[PDB]
Design a protein around this ligand. Structure first.
Ligand SMILES: O=C(O)c1c[nH]c2c(-c3ccc(OS(=O)(=O)F)cc3)cccc2c1=O
Length: 441
C-alpha cells in the first residue's frame, strides 16, 4: 500500500485487529534494517523500557534522546540514561514560555540505509499497550553513492523540509543527523512534512510552520471542488488548550480558516471535533487511568464551555479500537457524505494555540510555543483527486492505492445530552470503570 500509515498494536483486541498493526519491537526489529544508530525524539521517556524494545543485538548501538525537559525533570532523565553508556541526550531549546517538546520521531540509521518514523506515542509502556496511536513509516532510504551529486529530494520536498525542521534546534547532535540525511536518497517520499517549532515567524518564514504551513500546502497542492463549503473539517485530538472566550478568538477564525483552504483562488463549513467523553474513558480497556493521558483541566474547560458543543465521541469499530483511547491526533477534510477525503494529517499536535500557532502583531507574525511534527497525505501526491475512505481499516479494498485507512468511524457521533468531555482533574465516583475503580485525582 502507498500510504504506510499504521496503528500501534492493542493488547486485548482480536488478532484480526492487530494484523497490520505495529508494536515498537516490530519497528526496531532486524527485519526493518541492521541498526547502526538511532535518534528518539519524544516528550516522555522510560529509558529502561525503551532499551528493552530494541533487539538484544542492537541494544548497545548509540541512541540519542531528544527531549525538552529542564531543571529537576532534566536531571531525572539524565539519571534514567546514566546506566547506559551508549545513550546521549539533546535538550531542545524552549525559549518561549509554556512550550513543550511534543514531536515523536525516530531516525533509524542502518547498514542498508535510513528510515524515518513519525508517530504519536510516548516511549513508555502504557502508550503502546491499549491506546489508539498512529505511525507513519518512511521507505528504506538508500545511501547516495560517494562522489555522486544528486539532491535525493522528493516531489514533496520532504528531505529539505526535514533538514529545516532539524536545523531549528540549533543542536550539534542534530547537525550530525542532518549530515546523515544529506547522504541519503529520500526521493520516494510521498508525504509532506508539517512541523511546529518555537518562535515568532514573520515574512516568508510565516508559512514554514504550524497552521500556516498547512494552509500553504493546501493552497499549493490541493484544488477546490464545487460545493467545497459542504466538505466538513474533522479534528481529532487527546488534549485541548485554552482557545479563548468564544469561537471567533482562534478556533473558527484563523485555525478553521487554514483548515478549510483548498487551492489558490479566493463560513458554512461544518467542524467536527472528536474527543473522548467521560463514558468513553470509563468503559475503555484501561478504564479511568486512560484519562491520565487526556490532560484537559477543569480550569481551562470552564472558560470555554462553548467549545463542547463541537465535541463528538470516540468511536472506532472500523479498527476494533472503540475501547482503545486515542492518543493519536488526526485532521482531515471529508466529503459531505464522508465517503472521500481531500487530505489526511497525522501529527503530535493537539487542539491548542501552543501547537498550531497563534497570529500576533496585527496578523503579521505567527507565534508557536512548542515542537510538533506530523505528515500530510494529499491526493495530488499519489496521482489522485481525492482518497476513497477505507470501509474497514484492516480489510482488503478493491483498490488499496486509492483507499485511505481512516482509523475511526465516520460520521462522528455528537455527544449526548448526558455526555461530558473527559476532564482529568475532577473526580468521577458515580460508576466504576472496567477495572472496578473510581477516579479521585
Ligand atoms: O503530547 C503528549 O504526548 C503529552 C503531553 N503532555 C501530557 C501531559 C501533560 C499535560 C500538561 C502538562 O503541563 S501542566 O498542565 O501545566 F502540569 C504536563 C503534562 C499529561 C499526560 C499526558 C501527556 C501527553 O501525552
Amino acid at each position: 500500500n502507498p500510504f504506510q500509515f499504521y496503528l500501534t498494536r492493542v493488547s486485548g483486541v482480536k488478532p484480526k485487529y492487530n494484523s497490520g498493526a505495529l508494536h515498537i519491537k516490530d519497528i526496531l526489529s532486524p527485519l526493518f534494517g541492521t541498526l547502526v544508530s538511532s535518534a528518539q525524539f519524544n516528550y516522555c521517556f522510560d529509558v529502561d523500557w525503551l532499551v528493552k524494545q530494541y533487539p538484544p543485538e542492537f541494544r548497545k548501538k548509540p541512541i540519542l534522546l531528544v527531549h525538552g525537559d529542564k531543571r529537576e525533570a532534566k536531571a531525572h532523565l539524565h539519571a534514567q540514561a546514566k546506566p547506559y553508556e551508549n545513550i546521549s541526550l539533546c535538550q531542545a531549546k524552549l525559549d518561549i514560555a509554556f512550550g513543550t517538546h511534543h514531536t515523536k520521531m525516530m531516525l533509524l540509521l542502518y547498514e542498508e540505509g535510513l528510515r524515518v518514523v513519525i508517530h504519536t506515542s510516548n516511549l513508555i509502556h502504557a502508550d503502546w499497550h491499549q491506546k489508539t496511536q498512529g505511525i507513519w513509516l518512511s521507505p528504506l532510504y538508500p545511501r547516495i553513492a560517494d562522489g555522486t551529486h544528486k539532491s535525493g529530494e522528493s516531489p514533496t520536498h520532504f528531505k529539505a523540509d526535514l533538514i529545516s525542521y532539524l536545523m531549528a534546534y540549533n543542536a550539534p547532535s542534530l547537525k550530525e543527523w542532518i549530515d546523515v540525511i544529506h547522504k541519503h536518497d529520500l526521493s520516494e517520499t510521498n508525504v509532506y512534512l508539517i512541523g511546529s517549532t518555537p518562535g515568532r515567524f514573520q515574512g516568508s518564514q510565516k508559512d514554514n510552520w504550524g497552521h500556516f504551513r498547512l494552509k500553504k500546502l493546501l493552497k499549493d497542492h490541493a484544488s477546490s471542488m464545487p460545493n467545497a463549503e459542504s466538505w466538513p473539517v474533522v479534528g481529532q485530538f487527546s488534549s485541548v488548550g485554552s482557545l479563548g472566550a468564544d469561537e471567533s478568538k482562534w478556533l473558527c477564525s484563523e485555525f478553521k480558516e487554514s483548515m478549510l483552504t483548498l487551492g489558490k483562488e479566493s463560513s458554512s463549513v461544518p467542524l467536527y471535533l472528536i474527543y473522548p467523553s467521560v463514558e468513553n474513558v470509563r468503559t475503555s480497556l484501561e478504564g479511568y487511568p486512560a484519562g491520565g493521558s487526556l490532560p484537559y483541566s477543569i480550569q481551562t474547560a470552564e472558560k470555554q464551555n462553548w467549545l463542547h458543543s463541537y465535541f463528538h465521541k470516540w468511536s472506532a469499530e472500523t479498527s476494533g479500537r472503540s475501547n482503545a483511547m486515542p492518543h493519536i491526533k488526526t485532521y482531515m477534510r471529508p466529503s459531505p457524505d464522508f465517503s472521500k477525503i481531500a487530505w489526511f494529517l497525522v501529527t503530535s499536535a493537539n487542539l491548542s494555540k501552543a501547537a498550531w500557532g497563534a497570529l500576533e502583531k496585527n496578523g503579521t507574525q505567527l507565534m508557536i510555543r512548542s515542537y510538533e511534527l506530523g505528515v500530510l497525505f494529499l491526493p495530488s501526491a499519489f496521482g489522485l483527486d481525492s482518497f476513497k475512505v477505507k470501509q474497514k481499516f484492516f480489510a482488503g479494498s478493491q483498490e488499496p492505492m486509492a483507499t485511505f485507512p481512516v482509523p475511526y468511524d465516520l460520521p462522528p457521533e455528537l455527544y449526548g445530552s448526558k455526555d461530558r468531555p473527559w476532564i482529568w482533574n475532577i473526580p468521577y465516583v458515580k460508576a466504576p470503570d472496567t477495572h472496578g475503580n473510581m477516579w479521585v485525582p
